[PDB]
Amino acid sequence: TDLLAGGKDDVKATFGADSFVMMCIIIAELIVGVAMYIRTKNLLILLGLVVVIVFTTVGLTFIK
Amino acid sequence: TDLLAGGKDDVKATFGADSFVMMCIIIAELIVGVAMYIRTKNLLILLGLVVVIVFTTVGLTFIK
Amino acid sequence: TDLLAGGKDDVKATFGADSFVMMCIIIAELIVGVAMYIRTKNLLILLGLVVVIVFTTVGLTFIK
Amino acid sequence: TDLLAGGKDDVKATFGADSFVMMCIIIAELIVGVAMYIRTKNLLILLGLVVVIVFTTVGLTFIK
Amino acid sequence: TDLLAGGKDDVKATFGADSFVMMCIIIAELIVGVAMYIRTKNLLILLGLVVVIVFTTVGLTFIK
Amino acid sequence: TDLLAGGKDDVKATFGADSFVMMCIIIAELIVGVAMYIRTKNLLILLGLVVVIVFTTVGLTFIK
Amino acid sequence: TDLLAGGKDDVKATFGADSFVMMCIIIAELIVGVAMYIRTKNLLILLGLVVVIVFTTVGLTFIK
Amino acid sequence: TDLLAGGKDDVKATFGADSFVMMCIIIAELIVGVAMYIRTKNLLILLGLVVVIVFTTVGLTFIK
Amino acid sequence: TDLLAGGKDDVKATFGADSFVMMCIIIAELIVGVAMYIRTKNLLILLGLVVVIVFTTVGLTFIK
Amino acid sequence: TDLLAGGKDDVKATFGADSFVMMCIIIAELIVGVAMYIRTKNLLILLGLVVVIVFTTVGLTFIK
Amino acid sequence: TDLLAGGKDDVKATFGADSFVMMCIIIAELIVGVAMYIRTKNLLILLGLVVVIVFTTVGLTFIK
Amino acid sequence: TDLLAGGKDDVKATFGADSFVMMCIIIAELIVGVAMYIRTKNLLILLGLVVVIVFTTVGLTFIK
Amino acid sequence: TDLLAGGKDDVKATFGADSFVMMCIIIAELIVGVAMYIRTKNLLILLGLVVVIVFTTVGLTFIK
Amino acid sequence: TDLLAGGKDDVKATFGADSFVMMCIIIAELIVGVAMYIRTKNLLILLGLVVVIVFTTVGLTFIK
Amino acid sequence: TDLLAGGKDDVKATFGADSFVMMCIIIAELIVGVAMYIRTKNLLILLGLVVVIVFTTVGLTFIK
Amino acid sequence: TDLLAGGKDDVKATFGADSFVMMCIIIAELIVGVAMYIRTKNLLILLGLVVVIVFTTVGLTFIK
Amino acid sequence: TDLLAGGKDDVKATFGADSFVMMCIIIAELIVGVAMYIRTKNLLILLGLVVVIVFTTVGLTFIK
Amino acid sequence: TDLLAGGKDDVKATFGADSFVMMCIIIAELIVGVAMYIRTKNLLILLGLVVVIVFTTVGLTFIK
Amino acid sequence: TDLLAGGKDDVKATFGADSFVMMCIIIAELIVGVAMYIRTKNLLILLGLVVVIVFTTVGLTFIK
Amino acid sequence: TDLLAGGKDDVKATFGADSFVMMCIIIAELIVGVAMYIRTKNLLILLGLVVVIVFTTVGLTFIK
Amino acid sequence: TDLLAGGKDDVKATFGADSFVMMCIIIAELIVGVAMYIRTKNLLILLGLVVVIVFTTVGLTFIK
Amino acid sequence: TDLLAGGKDDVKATFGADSFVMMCIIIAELIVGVAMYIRTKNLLILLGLVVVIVFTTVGLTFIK
């Protein structure tokens, strides 16, 4: 061989578990979800946050 | 590595616990909830405020 | 950091304890409640006013 | 801050103690109450008028 | 402010002491009361007319 | 500036006191009200006509 | 403007005193009232017819 | 316009004095009244038939 | 700087207190409100007119 | 142009007095009305058939 | 054209005097009526069957 | 320019008083109205036909 | 041309009286109708099947 | 052709008399009907099952 | 074929005679029926249980 | 297979013979029955308790 | 040119009264209309077929 | 944690032992009870006042 | 793993045994129950308070 | 293989037996149920809590 | 051949009987169903879970 | 030729009865259908699976 193997580390660290990008994604889910809930009063929509957390955790496991 | 780690602090402070944004969100919940209650007279809708407070507190705990 | 901290004061004063907005909300509750009472003759509906007053007072305490 | 403080006076005067709106509300209570009494012959329903008067007086005291 | 003060006069005259509406209300009380009396033979029901007259007179005193 | 002041007259005359439009509105109130009364036998609904007349008269006073 | 004044006549004649529409309304009141009376045996309900006649006559007086 | 004047005749004949509809109404009064009398043994209820006949005759006089 | 300051006057006069536009807005509120009331018979809807008047008056105060 | 005058005949015959369409409409009224009557036992609903017949006859008179 | 005249026969036969549909309607009236009678013990409700039979017979006479 | 004046006649005749188009519009109102009435049993909906006739007559008066 | 006349037969046979397509349409009506009936318990909805059968039979008669 | 005739058999067998689909439909009627009966205690609702059975049997007869 | 025949067994066993679903249905009938009886003291309502048992037994016989 | 057989035990134990739910039901019968007896002094109403006990015992026997 | 007059015949025959194209159009209307009716159960939608037939007949009259 | 603990005091004071709300409740019990007694002459109904007093006192003890 | 375990404490404390929310619920039960009792004079309705207390205590035991 | 098998554990733990999500669901059932009971005074509604507990326990058994 | 046969196994295992995807689907049904039940209190909605289980089991049988 | 006849076999096998592609299509229908059902709770949507199976089977018969 993979002629670009050397690039895997930084990329994986910049889009990975404790990255700035994942923090921004969780913040966005929190804000957008609470705004949707305030507008519609559909309590189930708050589970969105849970979903995103799980999806980003488990999902990052498949990134090799 | 995280090539954007240095950006975590300000972002987290601007969308975080004692931020202007969270204050605006709580104000919005209060106003919208009391307006819904005045229109429909459904007392349970006022619990919306509680929900939002809890959701923003606990939720911000998962923002690393 | 909070890059928008400077905006907290005016916002809090315009949607806060002795604001024009809260006065309008209490007026709306009074009018709508007395209209509901005239139509239905359900005396309990007048407690709506009390509820709104309490909800706006206590609620504004959680706005930091 | 209260960026809309200047609007408090006219609003309070148009929905306040000696306003056209309160006169209309008392007239409506009188007419609707006497119609209910003529139909059902329930004398207690006439106390509705008293209630409305009291509710609009005391209630307007909490409008600051 | 009272931005609608100019409307008080006609309204008060159309739902007031010597109005067509009050005449219709007294007529309705008379007819409905005499019909109830013919059906049930409860003499006390005729006092309904008295009540309505008093209620409309005294009541209109509180309309300012 | 008022660059459209010249348009005030005709508009005010076409939606004003003795206009075709106001005649149509009063006719509609009469027909709809008598139909509601025939269906439900709620005599109070006929006061709708009175209300509309008053509302269109007093209301047109605020049209400057 | 009154740019639609020319339309007043036919409209007023088609929904007016001796119109087909008013005839249909009186017929409907007669039929519905006698059906209600046959079902409930409440003699007062027959006064509905009187009411409708009066309401359509006097009411049409206010149509200018 | 009266743009629907031409429709008055048939309508008036189909809901009028010697119509099928009036025959059905009188039949219904007879049957329902005799059934009520058989159940309750209140002789006065039979006067219902008289009432209906009178009401349909006199009433049809006001249909122009 | 304000390179467009010279434009403030006419604009403010064409959308301001005694403008043709505000007259049209009040007319629209009157017509739409009375139509809603005729359809639904919800008396509170007529307060819409009051609201609009107040909102346009107080609101125009904040236009500098 | 009237550049489409030639089309009047067939259209008028296909939606007119003795058309297949009017037969279907009367059949629909009969079926729907008897179904409503079976469900609710409201005898007056059967007059629907009469109404439809009259409405289609008189109405077709205004189709020129 | 009447461009759909050819369709009259089958339609009239499928919703007509001796059709499967009319049989189903009479069966439904019988079952629903006897169920209502068992529940309420109101003997008059059984006349429903008679009504339906008459209504379907006479009614089908007007289907041309 | 009026460089198209010559076109006024045919247009006015093809969309005018005794045109094929107006006939189609009245037919459509009749059919749609009777279908709505069969479905909902709201007798007032039949007045739609009257409205359309009046609206097309008076309206065509303003077409110059 | 008619330069495509030769295509009429197969088309008419594939969308015609005893075609696979018409069988699928009748099956769909049966399934959808019984599902609607199970959900709503509105017996009249089952007549949908009858309608579809009639509509496809008579309708196919006009396909030349 | 009928260019799709060969498809009739399997379709008819998969939505036909002894199919999995019809079994599911009867099961659904049984469950939904007994649930409705438990909630409302309206015994007549159980006849729904009978109706569905009949409707699916007779109906499948018209599927050719 | 019936392209879905293989699915009949499990479905029939999961909604059939000795299934978890039927047990839940009988439990629900027992609880709801005894609650209705405690509230209304109508002994006949307890026969509901019998009905449900019979309906589920006999009904499941028609599930092929 | 019965794909949900494994769920039978806990359900049956939670709504069964010695469950918290049955205890609550018997308590409710006792309280409601003694309250009815205190109000009406109808001694037979106390047999309600017996009925409920029997109904819950025998009934639970049919829960398989 | 008319240098293309010779082409009028075949074109008119291929898109004309008894053409393959018109047959396809009527088939499409039948299928689409019955599908819409099965989905929505709006009986009026079936009149679409009538409309199309009329529109194609009368319309083809204006094709010279 | 209890994120809303700070709100307990005012709420408890506004709906508590010596509150305006409890005063209104006792007044309502007194008026309604004496009106019931005047109508029915059932002396026991006056014990209602006692009940309410006790219920509000003891009940407020369980409010923590 | 439970990726949201850390959130259990505050939530449980904000909706738990000695929370502001439970206090509000008990207050609401007290007020609504005493209002129902004043209106209906059904003493048993006061047991509602007991029920709510028990339900909130025992119920909170199952919150893990 | 199942290319996503590794994700089963955390997901199952975050939506499983002792998760934060299930705690929130039980809390929601408790609050909503007690609010419904306070409003309607239907004691059976409190069994909702039981149902939810059972449904979440047994249901989680089928999650493999 | 089938030039892509080699891909069948992994696909079938990743969307098949004991896959992560099917687990997520069952979890989603459980959560959404219990949320719907808490909101609407319609017990039948809980059968959704059963349906999904059956549908995914039987359905996966047809995946070859 | 047919200069490309030799290509028919592999193509037909790769998009044919037991191909990887058809397996993927059935899987997609199953997943999408169960997701739609979980969201909307419309049981009829599950028949989608049946439809797809039938459509792919019968349809592949016409591929020569």
Ligand SMILES: CCCCCCCCCCCCCCCC(=O)OC[C@H](COP(=O)(O)OC[C@@H](O)CO)OC(=O)CCCCCCCCCCCCCCC
């Ligand atoms: C400077 C402008 C000040 C505006 C007036 C202040 C409040 C006066 C209270 C009047 C109440 C009666 C209105 C009836 C006319 C009207 O609009 O009727 C609309 C609607 C009619 O009520 P119903 O639900 O019975 O009617 C339903 C349908 O018929 C409506 O189409 O009223 C409501 O739903 C009232 C609920 C108020 C919800 C709370 C509002 C909180 C915001 C406070 C106001 C905004 C301030 C703006 C600042 C610039």
Ligand SMILES: CCCCCCCCCCCCCCCC(=O)OC[C@H](COP(=O)(O)OC[C@@H](O)CO)OC(=O)CCCCCCCCCCCCCCC
């Ligand atoms: C300048 C315009 C002034 C308007 C007149 C002022 C009030 C006169 C009182 C008449 C009462 C009788 C009306 C019966 C005709 C009518 O509408 O009947 C509608 C409805 C009929 O009462 P029921 O509930 O018995 O009937 C139910 C159904 O049959 C209705 O379809 O009446 C009410 O519900 C009355 C409750 C009033 C609720 C309080 C209203 C408070 C607002 C005050 C009025 C608005 C002011 C507008 C300012 C621009």
Ligand SMILES: CCCCCCCCCCCCCCCC(=O)OC[C@H](COP(=O)(O)OC[C@@H](O)CO)OC(=O)CCCCCCCCCCCCCCC
């Ligand atoms: C210009 C129009 C003037 C209208 C006539 C004026 C009043 C005449 C009095 C007739 C009374 C008998 C009517 C029986 C025919 C009728 O409608 O019966 C309906 C109903 C029948 O009474 P029951 O409660 O015994 O019957 C219950 C059911 O059978 C009704 O379906 O009567 C009442 O409830 C009467 C209570 C009147 C409530 C007070 C009304 C106050 C408003 C005044 C009138 C409106 C003025 C409109 C101005 C444009």
Ligand SMILES: CCCCCCCCCCCCCCCC(=O)OC[C@H](COP(=O)(O)OC[C@@H](O)CO)OC(=O)CCCCCCCCCCCCCCC
């Ligand atoms: C030159 C044209 C003149 C038009 C006639 C003038 C008014 C005649 C009054 C007839 C009333 C009965 C109509 C029933 C036929 C009809 O349309 O029924 C529709 C609808 C049926 O009432 P429901 O709410 O009971 O029915 C609900 C549904 O079944 C409707 O689909 O009626 C209304 O809602 C009436 C409310 C009127 C709202 C106020 C209207 C104010 C505007 C005045 C009219 C416009 C003037 C146009 C100028 C060019």
Ligand SMILES: CCCCCCCCCCCCCCCC(=O)OC[C@H](COP(=O)(O)OC[C@@H](O)CO)OC(=O)CCCCCCCCCCCCCCC
């Ligand atoms: C050229 C067409 C002429 C139409 C006939 C003229 C009127 C004949 C009177 C028949 C009354 C009995 C109808 C029962 C059949 C029927 O429709 O029942 C529907 C409904 C049934 O009454 P209930 O409220 O007891 O029933 C409730 C439900 O079962 C209805 O589904 O009747 C009414 O509500 C009647 C109230 C009439 C409201 C006033 C109507 C004013 C408009 C006048 C008529 C329109 C003219 C149209 C001009 C083109």
Ligand SMILES: CCCCCCCCCCCCCCCC(=O)OC[C@H](COP(=O)(O)OC[C@@H](O)CO)OC(=O)CCCCCCCCCCCCCCC
């Ligand atoms: C061509 C069709 C001719 C129809 C027959 C003509 C009238 C025969 C009289 C039979 C009366 C007994 C029916 C009991 C069967 C029945 O329906 O019971 C329903 C109901 C039962 O009366 P109760 O109030 O005691 O029962 C209440 C509940 O148990 C009902 O569910 O009866 C009435 O309310 C009768 C009041 C009639 C109201 C006046 C009707 C005026 C319209 C005239 C008839 C319509 C003509 C249609 C023309 C196409």
Ligand SMILES: CCCCCCCCCCCCCCCC(=O)OC[C@H](COP(=O)(O)OC[C@@H](O)CO)OC(=O)CCCCCCCCCCCCCCC
């Ligand atoms: C020089 C031109 C003057 C124009 C007339 C002035 C206002 C007259 C008021 C008539 C109101 C009734 C119209 C019904 C005919 C109509 O358009 O109906 C459309 C629509 C129908 O109302 P619904 O929401 O019930 O109907 C929904 C759908 O059926 C519409 O397709 O009406 C509205 O939504 C009204 C809301 C007005 C919103 C406020 C408008 C503020 C702007 C003021 C006007 C513009 C001035 C232009 C200056 C050049």
Ligand SMILES: CCCCCCCCCCCCCCCC(=O)OC[C@H](COP(=O)(O)OC[C@@H](O)CO)OC(=O)CCCCCCCCCCCCCCC
């Ligand atoms: C050549 C085709 C001939 C078609 C049959 C002719 C009419 C037969 C009458 C059957 C009525 C019962 C249908 C129930 C099956 C059905 O569709 O139920 C749908 C619906 C169910 O009524 P509900 O309002 O009680 O149900 C509401 C919901 O459950 C519907 O989903 O029925 C109606 O609303 C009926 C109103 C008819 C409105 C008037 C229609 C006027 C047009 C005439 C027919 C079109 C002719 C087409 C020519 C090509």
Ligand SMILES: CCCCCCCCCCCCCCCC(=O)OC[C@H](COP(=O)(O)OC[C@@H](O)CO)OC(=O)CCCCCCCCCCCCCCC
């Ligand atoms: C080939 C299919 C043949 C179907 C059977 C023929 C009719 C058998 C009569 C059974 C009546 C009892 C049904 C109870 C089961 C049921 O559905 O209950 C639903 C409903 C329950 O009545 P309630 O109003 O007491 O209940 C209200 C609610 O609980 C309903 O959810 O029943 C009715 O409203 C009956 C009124 C019938 C209206 C007249 C119908 C006219 C159409 C004729 C039938 C359609 C023919 C279709 C041809 C393909």
Ligand SMILES: CCCCCCCCCCCCCCCC(=O)OC[C@H](COP(=O)(O)OC[C@@H](O)CO)OC(=O)CCCCCCCCCCCCCCC
């Ligand atoms: C030479 C061609 C002549 C065409 C026939 C003339 C009119 C016959 C009246 C039939 C009415 C029933 C149609 C139902 C079949 C149909 O299309 O249903 C579509 C739609 C269904 O009504 P709903 O709103 O209940 O249904 C909503 C959805 O289900 C529609 O997908 O009907 C309407 O909205 C009718 C409103 C008519 C609006 C006014 C039209 C004015 C124009 C006049 C006609 C055009 C003339 C063309 C000249 C070349």
Ligand SMILES: CCCCCCCCCCCCCCCC(=O)OC[C@H](COP(=O)(O)OC[C@@H](O)CO)OC(=O)CCCCCCCCCCCCCCC
């Ligand atoms: C060789 C392929 C044969 C296909 C099967 C033949 C028909 C079997 C009938 C099954 C009906 C149930 C389907 C539910 C699954 C489904 O698709 O649900 C979709 C939809 C769901 O109905 P709802 O309106 O209640 O649902 C709305 C939303 O949830 C949809 O997302 O169903 C309909 O709208 C049915 C209306 C049928 C309209 C008439 C169709 C006429 C065409 C005939 C079929 C095409 C033949 C193709 C030949 C190659």
Ligand SMILES: CCCCCCCCCCCCCCCC(=O)OC[C@H](COP(=O)(O)OC[C@@H](O)CO)OC(=O)CCCCCCCCCCCCCCC
């Ligand atoms: C291989 C998969 C087999 C699936 C199971 C077979 C049927 C089992 C019967 C269970 C009924 C209870 C479901 C409640 C759970 C549920 O979905 O509740 C949804 C809904 C809830 O009923 P309500 O109208 O009371 O509720 C309204 C709202 O709360 C819904 O959100 O139920 C219905 O409307 C039932 C009407 C069935 C309409 C007839 C369906 C005909 C199709 C047959 C089934 C499809 C077969 C698919 C083949 C692959």
Ligand SMILES: CCCCCCCCCCCCCCCC(=O)OC[C@H](COP(=O)(O)OC[C@@H](O)CO)OC(=O)CCCCCCCCCCCCCCC
């Ligand atoms: C694994 C999960 C097992 C669930 C428990 C099994 C059944 C236990 C019986 C408890 C009954 C009392 C519930 C009261 C709590 C509740 O929900 O109250 C809601 C409602 C309240 O009844 P009311 O009509 O008096 O109340 C009306 C309103 O206040 C409701 O908001 O109850 C009913 O309508 C009961 C009718 C049951 C209809 C038959 C259901 C058949 C399906 C069987 C159960 C589904 C099985 C799911 C399998 C996964």
